[PDB]
Design an enzyme around this catalytic site. Structure first.
Site, short mmCIF file in Angstrom:
data_model
loop_
_atom_site.label_atom_id
_atom_site.label_comp_id
_atom_site.label_asym_id
_atom_site.label_seq_id
_atom_site.Cartn_x
_atom_site.Cartn_y
_atom_site.Cartn_z
N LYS B 21 19.34 -30.53 38.20
CA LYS B 21 20.13 -31.37 37.31
C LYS B 21 20.04 -30.66 35.86
O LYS B 21 20.96 -30.52 35.15
CB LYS B 21 19.69 -32.81 37.36
CG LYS B 21 19.96 -33.24 38.68
CD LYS B 21 19.93 -34.85 38.77
CE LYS B 21 20.06 -35.44 40.10
NZ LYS B 21 20.65 -36.85 39.83
N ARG B 91 16.50 -39.42 34.11
CA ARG B 91 17.04 -39.18 35.50
C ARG B 91 15.93 -38.14 36.14
O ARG B 91 15.84 -37.01 35.27
CB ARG B 91 18.39 -38.82 35.60
CG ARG B 91 19.00 -39.59 34.70
CD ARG B 91 20.83 -39.09 34.75
NE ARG B 91 21.08 -39.34 36.46
CZ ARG B 91 22.42 -39.00 36.65
NH1 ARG B 91 23.51 -38.80 35.87
NH2 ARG B 91 22.63 -39.38 38.17
N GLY B 100 20.76 -39.07 46.75
CA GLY B 100 20.26 -40.53 47.21
C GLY B 100 18.85 -40.65 47.22
O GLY B 100 18.56 -41.79 47.55
N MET B 102 16.63 -39.39 44.14
CA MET B 102 16.15 -39.58 43.10
C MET B 102 16.27 -40.73 42.31
O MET B 102 16.74 -41.44 42.49
CB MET B 102 16.55 -38.30 42.32
CG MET B 102 16.60 -37.01 43.12
SD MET B 102 15.09 -36.50 43.87
CE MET B 102 13.87 -36.44 42.09
N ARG B 336 26.80 -30.21 40.44
CA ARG B 336 26.07 -29.69 41.28
C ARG B 336 27.02 -29.37 42.37
O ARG B 336 27.98 -29.55 42.58
CB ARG B 336 25.05 -30.59 41.98
CG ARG B 336 25.48 -31.88 42.11
CD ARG B 336 24.12 -32.70 42.53
NE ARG B 336 24.70 -34.28 43.14
CZ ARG B 336 23.47 -35.30 43.37
NH1 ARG B 336 22.39 -35.21 43.15
NH2 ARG B 336 23.86 -36.32 43.74
N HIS B 454 25.10 -45.07 49.01
CA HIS B 454 23.99 -44.50 49.42
C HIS B 454 23.99 -44.08 50.64
O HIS B 454 23.55 -43.06 51.27
CB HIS B 454 22.64 -45.37 49.20
CG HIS B 454 21.53 -44.64 49.61
ND1 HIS B 454 20.55 -44.44 50.84
CD2 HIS B 454 20.50 -43.94 48.95
CE1 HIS B 454 19.58 -44.04 51.05
NE2 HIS B 454 19.29 -43.68 49.66
N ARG B 560 14.66 -18.82 82.85
CA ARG B 560 13.08 -19.58 83.56
C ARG B 560 13.36 -19.48 85.15
O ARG B 560 14.66 -19.53 85.47
CB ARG B 560 13.10 -21.08 83.02
CG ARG B 560 12.34 -20.97 81.60
CD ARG B 560 13.19 -22.27 80.98
NE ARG B 560 12.53 -23.71 81.08
CZ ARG B 560 13.53 -24.74 81.15
NH1 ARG B 560 14.68 -24.81 80.97
NH2 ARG B 560 12.71 -25.87 81.17
N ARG B 616 11.93 -14.30 83.38
CA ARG B 616 10.46 -14.63 83.55
C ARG B 616 9.91 -15.15 84.86
O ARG B 616 10.58 -16.28 85.39
CB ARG B 616 10.18 -15.80 82.17
CG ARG B 616 8.92 -16.15 82.17
CD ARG B 616 8.79 -17.80 82.67
NE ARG B 616 8.56 -18.43 81.23
CZ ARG B 616 8.82 -19.73 81.13
NH1 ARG B 616 9.11 -20.53 82.06
NH2 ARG B 616 8.48 -20.07 80.18
N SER B 763 8.85 -10.11 74.64
CA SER B 763 9.32 -11.42 74.27
C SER B 763 8.53 -12.30 73.75
O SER B 763 7.40 -12.47 74.27
CB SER B 763 10.05 -12.24 75.55
OG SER B 763 10.87 -13.22 74.58
N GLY B 765 6.66 -15.78 73.00
CA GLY B 765 7.01 -16.83 73.36
C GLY B 765 6.22 -17.86 72.51
O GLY B 765 5.01 -18.05 72.44
N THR B 766 6.97 -18.11 71.52
CA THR B 766 6.25 -18.85 70.18
C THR B 766 5.74 -20.24 70.39
O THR B 766 4.86 -20.65 69.71
CB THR B 766 6.85 -18.68 68.90
OG1 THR B 766 8.41 -19.16 69.16
CG2 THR B 766 6.92 -17.31 68.31
N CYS B 830 11.75 -16.26 71.99
CA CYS B 830 12.55 -17.30 72.92
C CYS B 830 11.93 -18.45 72.98
O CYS B 830 12.33 -19.60 73.73
CB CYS B 830 12.58 -16.80 74.36
SG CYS B 830 11.13 -16.55 75.10
N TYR B 850 16.26 -9.00 68.64
CA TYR B 850 17.04 -10.11 69.01
C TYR B 850 16.52 -11.53 68.97
O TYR B 850 15.18 -11.49 69.01
CB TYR B 850 17.83 -9.90 70.25
CG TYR B 850 16.83 -10.14 71.46
CD1 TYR B 850 16.57 -11.45 72.08
CD2 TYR B 850 16.22 -9.01 71.81
CE1 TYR B 850 15.99 -11.57 73.39
CE2 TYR B 850 15.45 -9.22 73.18
CZ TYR B 850 15.40 -10.38 73.51
OH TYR B 850 14.57 -10.62 74.85
N LIG Z 1 3.95 -20.08 78.72
#
Ligand SMILES: [N+]
Ligand SMILES: [N+]
Lengths: 872, 872
Positions: B21, B91, B100, B102, B336, B454, B560, B616, B763, B765-766, B830, B850
């Protein structure tokens, strides 16, 4: 003159003379491709044949035989020679591509003696006789018109008799046998004449048959359906033969460089080993998908895929190719820009611009505008589809959701559709003869044939659903029933087809309105960049207005107002005004309608948000609003305190000999200005209020119908102006509005400079202008229009395609003269022609400002207008 | 340091210090716009406040007052002076825009004495006291936290008492009265303290309240929901006041240069005559659509529309502006880049490129990727919608098809959603306090408030349906019921909302899957042009594969295989193998599964058409496949000829303390290679056959799960290779295949150079890597994760957003070391993180090839990947 060109003597630019197939054969020759040599008898030769009382002139035949001699020298073999013959294919092709409709005769030259020399020279008797019975069959079909049925019944008798399961399992011995039965057929049909044994007679018979066929009833009709003029004629291509039926390392195929149904990039199509083209199209042996050839013949595939990419790059568009592999050697027989569905055209044109192969202008120009109607075909309601009973599946030959009553002959399907039924044509396979029933169907289902089968390709062309090659089906022609999965089906029974997945359903699966691609939104963005015409829509309700705007409409070119009087809660007001006997009682009755109509107009201005809307004032004669039922007449007499007799007398009084040209439109506003005064108050009160509520400016367009004379329009305009100004004063408004007219009476166009003195805009009502220019009513014209099409008197329906030659003259003159008196005069068209491409092109060229079509035709008009801008 | 800047001393580049702002106020000042002068207390001042035990340091206050003095000199009036005061607005605004959320306090400076000088100088007592009771209210709300309820109840008591119908119908006399009641409230809440009378105390109290609020529970949660770091702090903007409540030629408004819901070009928004901002947001008086201002004040509209276009052209994007008209003079208070829905972002970015205002790169970079999930929200089944019972209608504030059970408090709605209910929040209007319930709702319905209310703006932000300002509704908070149209509704009752049309329905209207714009397909084409990462999908069936490809997926990163064992017709095979006691009987049981699984794989390769699929191998421990029900255990004992006791003993034997880290994945293939041998045969037989049937090449990717050690992966890979080569020999195939691994155990990433010696791809697997890196199971982590968010320990959920700081370290190292031993090593991700933008950006930067996400998140990944490419 010169009636024959060698391939080497032509190119793509000579299309009108060589036909598209001949010019493409020439062009591939020029590129050095492995194309068997041949020549083309020109389209002019076809006109000449027709100008000589349907006969080949001496000069032409001389030139055909000359070229044949040229062919012989190149090959080292004499045409149809008893010893080592040279055989040829004969194929027809006009300037315009007509997939599934032209003719092909392979192996021409064979005869009782040449076939033995052929067998000896190739060392392969089975192959020689297979080629012969093929040729006897193709020639009997194409030249005379003996039905394959006669031949297929015999080939099946013999295979079934000999226990064998395939055409390919016939001995050279069976084939000699088969040929003789085949010749017996032709004779048993030629009033005793024997199948021509002289190679030269066979060639001329085939050439004449090609010219002759240009006028067959099915070609005539197909040409009208595709906007192809007949005077174009057709050429005949004659080429040295290459054989895909020589053995296991021989084959033939048809492929597209990108998919013609979806537009996805990558080879698509099919082939057969040891076969001639005919075989692939028929699907008795299941055709193998083109990609599989890589497994069978890797080297020939490599070569084919390279040449295929070379062809797409040379022509700069997706190609539909035909090839033949003769004992390991690849030959290309044909290439043409492939026919395709609308989604496929958008996808493809879009990919070609992104790969840098073509410009945006080129993309826009190449898409067939009429085909965008396909984008708005209802698709199935997904819930209903999952809930649906799958009874079988096959090839998704042509996309779309088809649902209808089944019929088993193209004629029944057409007759049924004409009575207003949604129809599904189910056949073993289709043929050029089925074209009109195919065109009438919601969808097409077949028992045999793949992606390049007759139904597949003609259907993609039409943008019609098609699932093909469903072998699980059992058709009982005679009984008009077929069995698939859980049960037998009977003529009329509903079934549904998903041309995208190939699935077949029992019953009538529910459909919903379609949505839109991004290649579609992309193509429209490029279109807009080029078009100069604006595109408005013919819409009478908020709902149609919104649909139309969503497709690109920039406002409304025709908002009919009859429904505002016809509706259950409106009709009694107008009936009361008609049965009145005082201008005072007419006004009082009319006035009751104001609140209702003002309300309909506020809803429209609310949905328009500032977009212009041309409001047509009351169009039909009064008879249309009075009851025509003694029962309703009685009810009205009762509500008005009149006797049934009185009401009936008024109804009788309003009756007319020819309602199309009676007391209606402008002439009714003249006798009863009260009607126009009321529609003006409804219109102006609605606009002013919606402008006060939103601040969004409105400039009402009030259009007076069926005007023929300047002072006639002035009389009505004065009435309207007086009420508009009064409403403005009462509401404290300075709103602006324009009063224009329809140009739908020939006199209005002839005197348009005078009409323009009072009219602020012109809308061309071409439905009526065409009726009054041709002198016939659309509703009574079906009892002769069809005889006119069949006799070639007309090549297009004047109600669906603007008649440029005559009616076009009046539209052109009206704009020219109207602008002599009012240079900035705005001109639109709102007859059905505004959604037709050729018409839209004519309007762009004669100077109109906008065209106006039904909501779902808006995309077609937007693209056609861009195209007119670029092509002119 | 320097803690305060005048507007003239800043610009758009100083955003991080001035907040968005403040930098925009600076930028408009630089442009010479009619912006009331003021200054900004920096975000650094907020960090300083926090580093001083939540207190304003002497230096900062000194600098605030200094600037105030600067303001006074410019104006010629002393701040809050008893005679001719200068009043200010205060402000808040951080580097990131949070519509909505601040704070705004107008009229600061007023007090018991200044209000009389104000009244005298303006000559308008009603205006003076109106301003005072406003300020008393806004300050009580913002600074302390007295609920408007206390104030709104009193203002309504008085108006109702005085018969008047509007806030505007209060006399200067009533307003003096009202203010005193208002001050009584604040005191009746401040343990007896009186509303601050010193202008300077009011300013500091407001400034401190802004810094204090940065840490309110609702800001903390909102920031997590929008990925905003807390350390950013917030700045405070202080500006000279302009008054839209001075009279009939004064007003205030909020408008967007293009529509934020649809993206359509053209002014959108609302205003009120004789009002302050607060009024417009509240909707007690129906706000007028911005376009209508042209009718009331044509000259001020002209000026406003010109400045508005100038702002969009300067910022080169759609602007959300606030303006105030003080007695005929136009002032701009704020601008803005406007928040907007995803469809609106695509439309707009697309129009801006076409008008030549921005480049394709700029379009791509500016769209908020996470917001594209909105494009795939189900829309209503049209049939069902027409069949639906409309019970009322109002403003289409935010688009979408919402259907759910009604709740009347943000807390109930959230609690209900958490139990798995689709919820609809119905409220008089919403407030920052409702944020979490709003976020939980399918839709939001309100009684008052327009397009800038709002609920409207927060909902557009969330991409959530919202119909607002339905005055016909009657809410009975206490009873938890509301009446609309035909009937009363009760907590839990289903209703449906169409955020596009504003229509409200009784019941749960059916929805179906959405489709896609062309601006969406267009944006993806530009995205693809820039991204280098590929995007694959996590899909286990033909159906999800097709959906994913249709959205742009280039193959499958995770297929899977558990369902292939879990399914009713599969489960008994695996149960029989588990209960066996011989490697021979294990194999025999396993073998029965082959036909089933081979079949599932052929269907997937058939739908893939050559696109790669990472398969997998079996992931869970055996306990997951054995019955856990004494009843099912009994049935199995019966089918296998065992006693219930035996079966139970085997089940007990397979039980584990921590199933997440027990005998499963790779460790199970080691003990039972038979399992991997079988999945290999299913996979390779399916691929080879589909390749033979189509000719379309396949390169199977076989991924071994939960690997921690090179020789562990080698043991399994050997097993797999041996079976793959055997299947190849039996089928006469030379198909190629790769064997890779998941990197989901920290050890695998730490030793990735060794793992890469055997793994052909990685791969990530996170999901599991994050659990093992943080040491907690996702399923047990909800009993403390929420306390962690509330205490700011974590600012993001590690399961939804890749933890770059820690977990990211292992992903980066794995790719780096894996490529030390196998330079061309292919790497994908993945876990759920592959569909999250910031994570996708991290993966692009650390070198992955990827990312792979669920089908409906594919568009998000495709755009986020383009963005990562351009931003890096
Ligand atoms: N797993
Ligand atoms: N007409």
């Amino acid at each position: 003159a010169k009636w024959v060109y060698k391939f080497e003597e032509g190119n793509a630019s000579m299309r009108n003379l060589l036909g598209g197939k001949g010019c493409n054969l020439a062009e591939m020759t020029i590129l050095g491709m492995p194309i068997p040599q041949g020549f083309t008898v020109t389209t002019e030769a076809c006109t000449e044949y027709y100008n000589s009382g349907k006969q080949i002139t001496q000069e032409i035949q001389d030139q055909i035989f000359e070229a044949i001699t040229w062919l012989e020298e190149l090959n080292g073999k004499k045409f149809g020679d008893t010893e080592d013959p040279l055989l040829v294919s004969v194929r027809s092709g006009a300037r315009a591509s007509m997939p599934g409709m032209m003719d092909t005769i392979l192996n021409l030259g064979l005869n009782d003696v040449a076939v033995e020399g052929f067998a000896k020279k190739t060392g392969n008797p089975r192959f020689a006789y297979d080629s012969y019975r093929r040729f006897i069959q193709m020639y009997s079909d194409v030249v005379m018109e003996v039905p394959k049925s006669h031949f297929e019944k015999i080939i099946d008798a013999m295979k079934e008799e000999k226990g064998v399961h395939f055409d390919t399992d016939l001995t050279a011995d069976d084939l000699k046998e088969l040929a003789e039965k085949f010749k017996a057929v032709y004779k048993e049909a030629m009033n005793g004449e024997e199948f021509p044994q002289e190679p030269k007679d066979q060639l001329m018979g085939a050439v004449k048959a090609v010219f002759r066929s240009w006028d067959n009833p099915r070609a005539i009709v197909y040409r009208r359906m595709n906007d192809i003029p007949g005077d174009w004629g057709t050429a005949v291509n004659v080429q040295t033969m290459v054989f895909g039926n020589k053995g296991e390392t021989s084959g033939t195929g048809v492929a597209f460089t990108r998919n013609p149904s979806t537009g996805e990039k990558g080879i698509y199509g099919e082939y057969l080993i040891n076969a001639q083209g005919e075989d692939v199209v028929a699907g008795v042996r299941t055709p193998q998908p083109i990609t599989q050839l890589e497994n069978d013949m890797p080297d020939c595939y490599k070569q084919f895929m390279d040449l295929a990419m070379k062809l797409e790059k040379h022509f700069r568009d997706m190609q539909d190719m035909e090839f033949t592999i003769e004992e390991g050697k690849l030959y290309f027989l044909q290439t043409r820009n492939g026919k395709r569905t609308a989604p496929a055209a958008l996808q493809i044109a879009c990919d070609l611009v992104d790969e840098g192969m073509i410009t945006e202008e080129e993309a826009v120009v190449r898409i067939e505008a009429k085909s965008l109607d396909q984008l708005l075909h209802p698709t199935f309601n997904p819930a209903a589809l999952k809930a649906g009973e799958v009874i079988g599946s096959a090839l998704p030959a042509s996309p779309g959701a088809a649902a209808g009553k089944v019929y088993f002959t193209a004629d029944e399907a057409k007759a049924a559709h004409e009575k207003g039924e949604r129809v599904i044509l189910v056949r073993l396979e289709t043929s050029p003869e089925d074209i009109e029933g195919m065109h009438a169907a919601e969808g097409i289902l077949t028992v045999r044939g793949g992606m390049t089968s007759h139904a597949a390709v003609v259907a993609r062309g039409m943008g019609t659903c098609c699932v093909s090659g469903c072998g699980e089906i059992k058709i009982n022609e005679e009984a008009k029933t077929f069995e698939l999965g859980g049960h037998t089906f009977a003529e009329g029974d509903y079934i549904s087809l998903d041309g995208s997945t190939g699935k077949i359903y029992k019953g009538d699966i529910e459909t919903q309105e379609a949505s839109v691609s991004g290649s579609f939104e992309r193509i429209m963005v490029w279109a807009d960049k080029f078009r100069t015409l604006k595109v408005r829509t013919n819409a009478d309700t908020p709902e149609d207005t919104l649909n139309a705007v969503k497709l690109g409409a920039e406002g409304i070119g025709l908002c009919r107002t009859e429904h505002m009087f016809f509706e259950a809660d409106r009709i009694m007001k107008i009936r009361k005004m008609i049965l009145s006997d005082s201008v005072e009682a007419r006004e009082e009755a009319l006035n009751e309608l104001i609140p209702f109509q003002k309300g309909d107009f506020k809803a429209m201005y609310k949905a328009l948000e500032g977009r212009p809307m041309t409001v047509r004032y009351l169009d039909p004669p009064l008879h249309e609003f009075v009851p025509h039922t003694e029962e309703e007449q009685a009810e009205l007499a009762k509500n008005m305190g009149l006797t049934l007799a009185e009401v009936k007398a008024k109804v009788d009084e309003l009756h007319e000999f020819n309602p199309m040209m009676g007391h209606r439109g402008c002439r009714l506003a003249v006798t009863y200005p009260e009607i126009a005064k009321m529609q003006t108050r409804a219109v102006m009160e609605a606009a002013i209020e919606v402008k006060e509520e939103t601040g969004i400016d409105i400039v009402p367009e009030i259009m007076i119908p069926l005007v023929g004379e300047k002072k006639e329009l002035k009389f009505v305009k004065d009435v309207v102006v007086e009420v508009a100004e009064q409403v403005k004063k009462e509401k404290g408004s300075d709103m602006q509005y324009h009063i224009g007219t329809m140009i739908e009476i020939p006199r209005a166009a002839l005197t348009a400079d005078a009409i323009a003195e009072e009219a602020e805009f012109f809308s061309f009502g071409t439905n009526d202008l065409t009726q009054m220019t041709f002198g016939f009513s659309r509703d009574d014209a079906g009892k002769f229009l069809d005889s006119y099409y069949k006799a070639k008197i007309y090549e297009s329906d004047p109600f669906a395609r603007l008649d440029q030659t005559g009616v076009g003259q009046l539209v052109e003159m009206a704009v020219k003269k109207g602008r002599q008196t009012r240079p900035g005069l705005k001109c639109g068209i709102c007859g059905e022609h505004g959604g037709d491409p050729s018409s839209v092109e004519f309007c762009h060229k004669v100077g109109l400002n906008y065209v106006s079509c039904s909501p779902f035709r808006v995309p077609i008009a937007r693209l056609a207008a861009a195209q007119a801008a670029l092509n002119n």
